[PDB]
């Protein structure tokens, strides 16, 4: 009886915690592709320098 009531509470709380965890994980995901893209940016720039250095050498 009352235990089922506690059940309502714990199940809802766990559900909301899971929701928040999913949202935070997705946010960190997006941030990680942001950092990957910036890293790609400087890598491409430095490679474009490296090509001309190779030619001059």
């Amino acid at each position: 009886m009352d235990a089922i009531k506690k059940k309502m509470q714990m199940l809802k709380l766990d559900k909301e915690n899971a929701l928040d965890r999913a949202e935070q994980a997705e946010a960190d995901k997006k941030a990680a592709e942001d950092r990957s893209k910036q890293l790609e940016d400087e890598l491409v720039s430095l490679q474009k320098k490296l090509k001309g250095t190779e030619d001059e050498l």
Binding site: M1, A3, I4, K7
Partner: protein, 56 residues
């Protein structure tokens, strides 16, 4: 003969009372049994939900 008639009248009154009370008992009996059937159903099902608490 008059006394026999009075006694027979009273006996018939009592016997009709017997039969009517028996019918009333019958109806009550059926209603109580159905009540307890559905009572045990709902009790078992509350217990099943508690089993759910165990599975969780």
């Amino acid at each position: 003969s008059d006394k026999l008639k009075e006694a027979e009248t009273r006996a018939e009154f009592a016997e009709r009372s017997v039969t009517k009370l028996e019918k009333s008992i019958d109806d009550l009996e059926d209603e109580l049994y159905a009540q307890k059937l559905k009572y045990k159903a709902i009790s078992e099902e509350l217990d099943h939900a508690l089993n759910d608490m165990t599975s969780i």
